[PDB]
Every structure is written in structure tokens, then in C-alpha cells.
Structure 1
Amino acid sequence: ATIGRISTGSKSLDKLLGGGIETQAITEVFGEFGSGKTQLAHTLAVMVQLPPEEGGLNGSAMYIDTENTFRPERLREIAQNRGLDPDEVLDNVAYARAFNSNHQMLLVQQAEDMIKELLNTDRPVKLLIVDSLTSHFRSEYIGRGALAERQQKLAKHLADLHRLANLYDIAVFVTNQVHILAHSATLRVYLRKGKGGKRIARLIDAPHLPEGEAVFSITEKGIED
């Protein structure tokens, strides 16, 4: 099945990504607080709803929040400033708070129910966001021997997410706070602050995409160049 691409709002970042965030893939962004990772998540939750000539997939979004980062009024602002109705856009982002890592796993199973329900409608789910994907796992699995257990549980969670991406042709977008641990996202992107309020993006361990860094801004439209 054809891979779909969701624009980030930034031509620069889209170019680095090969056209946008991909369906049938998990894209992980990681960086410090304020590096742009959560702003990008909010922007994508709007962009996915646009028709494809505007960089979207005529879809809806689901957002799993682990550390209370979701801001409905930020979605509304981004929508309004892109010419969209803020309430309709907000209504197309299904939201759930994950209370702990086990609940987070259950939420992925519930996400599948909604994805199945909407799959063949005029507005299928096309984006699943997990913000700070590792936060509960790092809180709960800690101490002697916790590395193997935590990594096994994360690997399983990520396998579940890969399955949804592949089976239902959706983009999975995950964020993490910031060197020898294994990772299993399809594509990893490091974000950092740069000069002039810009953020800088770099692909990590991706020899299949060309060399470079993207530069973008955080604005009233979410993310843009």
C-alpha cells in the first residue's frame, strides 16, 4: 500500500523527512523540553486533517498524553491560523491520558478499536501520537536489572504500535526526552534549539536519507520555516 505523508508545516523539515511524516512507520522525535517535539505533535494533529494538496491525509488523530502536555487551545490556535475551524479540528483529535505504562498499553488496544471503526469512512484515523512514550516506563522500571525488563516492555509496546501503523496505514509519531540503549522506531529525529528562536532537526542513524539539518520556527501556525 502507498505510503502517505503528513506535512510538518515546515518545508525545511519536510525536505529532511523526504516529504513529511510517513504512514506505515513510527517516527520518533527526541530532545530537551522546549526543543519543539510537543509543538510538532500538536501541529501534526492539525495537518493530518487537511486534504493531500495541503499536506494532510483527510484524516483524524489520536493523542496519548503521558505527562500532561496536551493543550487543546494550542490545537485551536494552530487551526484558526491555518484557516480551519478550531472546534471541528479539536473534535478530530481523540485524546487520552495514560496513567501508567500498563494503562498506556491498554490505550493502544483501545486505539485499534477506533481505527477499525473509522477505517472506511471519509475521515479515517491517520495519526497516532504518543507524547513522552518512555516516561512511565522509566519511572516504573528502575533499579538493578531493570534495563532488560524495561527494554523488553518498550519493545513490545513499539511492536504493537508498528502493527497499527502497518495494518491500518497510519503514521505513528512518538516523542521522548533525551546513548547505548536500543531503539526500534522506523526513523529517529533529534531536535534542539538554535539561534534566533529556531529549532534544528537532525536525522539519527539514517543512511537511507541524505545529509543535512532542517531549521524551523514555532509560531501561531504551530511549526513553519
Structure 2
Amino acid sequence: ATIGRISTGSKSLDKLLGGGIETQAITEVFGEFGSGKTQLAHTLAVMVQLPPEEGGLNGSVMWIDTENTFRPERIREIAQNRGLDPDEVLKHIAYARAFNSNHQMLLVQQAEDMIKELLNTDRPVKLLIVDSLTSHFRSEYIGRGALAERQQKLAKHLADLHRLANLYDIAVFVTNQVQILAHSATLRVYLRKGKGGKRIARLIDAPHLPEGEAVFSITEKGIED
């Protein structure tokens, strides 16, 4: 079935992404603390709700938070400044905090129930955010023996996420804070905060996709060129 593409709000980042983040894919954004990974997540959670001719998918959102970083006030700000009703935009976000990595993994199964419920309504789930994908795994699986174990558990979690993306035509967007390991996301985007506080994005290990870097700003509309 044909994939959909969610605009990020930045023409530059959209071009880097071939039009936007894809359904039937896991897009991982990685970078240091303060890079803007969670800002992009908030922005996407509003953009996906737009109609397709405005770069959205008329979609609902599910959000798994591991760091208490979801900010309903930020959603409100982005929505208002894009002509949308903040309370309606919030209504179409379903939110859960993951207590630990095992609960995070179970929450993906829990999410499937709502996905099925909304599937043939006019606002099916089209975006599933996991922010942070890795923070609980990093704190729990640590020390001698942990690299293999952690990588195994994370790969299984990502397999579960790939299944939801692919079976239900959803864009999965995940964040990873990075200061040699295998990764199984579909597309990896390195984000950094540069001079002037501009954010800069580069695709990693994607030789057939745009070489170049996108640059964008964090604004009251989420992100913009």
C-alpha cells in the first residue's frame, strides 16, 4: 500500500527527507541533548493532523514518553500559530508515560488496540512517537554483558514498532540521545545545534538519498526554515 509523507514544517528538512517522514518506516532522530529532537516530535504531532494538501495525513497521534518531556503547552502553541484549534489537536494525541523499558515494550502492544479502533475512522493513527527510544535501555542494561542483551531487547522493540508501521500504515518517529552499535531504524537523521542556534540535520548511512544538510529554526510554529 502506498506510503504517506508528513511534512516537518521546514522546506529544507522536507527536501532532505524526500517530502517528509514516511509511513511504513521508523525514522530515528539522534543527537546530543538540546539538539531539537523533542521539538521535531512536537511539531510532527501537529503537522500529521493537517489535511494532505497541507502536508499532513488527517491523522491521530500516539506518544510514548520516557523522560517526561511531552509538553501540551508546546502543542498548543504550534497548533494555534498554524491556524488550528489547540484543544482539538491535543484531543487527537493519545499519550502514555513508560515507567521502564519493559513497560515501554508492552505499551507498543497496548497501542495496537487504539490503532485498530481508529483505523477505518476519518482520523486513523498516522504517527507513533517514542521519545526517548533508548533512555530506559541505557539505564537498565549496563555493564559487562549488557551490550548484547540491550541490543537484542532494543531490536525486538524496534521489530514490534516496524510491524505497527507496516501493518497499519503509520509513521514511527523515535529519538535517541547520542554523545559502533547496530541500528535497525529505517532512516537515521543526525541533528545538531549549530551557530546562532540554527538546527542542522544530515541523513546517516543513506547513500542514495540527498547528500547535503537541512537547516531550520525552532519557532512558535514548531520548526520553520
Cα separation, 1, equivalents of 2:218 and 2:3: 27
State the distance in 1 between where 2:196 and 2:18 align: 25
Give the distance between the partners of 2:36 and 2:71, measured in 1 at CA. 14
Displacement of 1:197 after TM fit? 2.0
User: How far did residue 195 of structure 1 move?
Assistant: 1.9
Which residue of the partner structure matches residue 39 of structure 2?
39
Aligned 8 A contact 2:203 2:210 in 1: no
Aligned residues: 225
Offset at 1:125?
Answer: 0.2
CA contact (8 A) 2:32 2:179 kept: no
Can you list the C-alpha shifts for 1:71-104, whole angstroms capped at 9, x where unaligned?
0000000000000000000111111000000000
1:158-215 Cα shifts (integer Å, max 9, x gaps)? 0000000000000000001009000000000000012222100000000120210000
1:55 Cα shift?
A: 0.5
Rate the CA distance shift 1:216–1:62 in 2: closer, same or farther, 3 A: same
Q: Indicate the SS of the match to 1:99.
A: coil
TM-score (norm 1): 0.99
- 1:87 aligned residue: 87
Please give the per-residue CA displacement for 1:130-181, whole angstroms capped at 9, x wherever unaligned: 0010010111111111111000000000000000000000000000100900
**CA contact 2:30–2:191 (8 Å) conserved in 1:** yes
C-alpha contact 2:132 2:176 (8 A) present in aligned 1: yes
Q: Cα distance, 1:36 vs. partner?
A: 1.0
Distance 2:21 2:43 in 1: 12
Pairing of 1:1-225 with structure 2 (within 5 A): 1-178=1-178, 180-225=180-225
Does structure 1 conserve the Cα–Cα contact (< 8 Å) formed by 2:31 and 2:179?
no
Q: For 1:34 and 1:90, how far apart are their aligned partners in 2?
A: 24
Paired with 1:159 and 1:121, the residues of 2 have a C-alpha distance of 26
| 1:31-55 Cα distance to aligned partner (Å, 9 max, x none) | 1121111000000000000001110
Percentage identity across paired residues of the two chains: 97
> Which consecutive unaligned segments of at least 5 residues does structure 1 have?
none
Report SS of the residue matched to 1:130: strand
Return the TM-score normalized by structure 2. 0.99
Pick which of 16-25 and 189-198 moved more: 189-198
Worse overlay, 97-106 or 192-201: 192-201
In structure 2, what is the Cα distance between the partners aligned to 1:31 and 1:141?
Answer: 20
Cα distance, 1:2 vs structure 2: 0.6
**Counterparts of 1:101 and 1:173, CA distance in 2:** 17
Output the CA distance in 1 between the equivalents of 2:211 and 2:173.
22
Query: How far 1:28 moved relative to its partner?
Result: 0.1
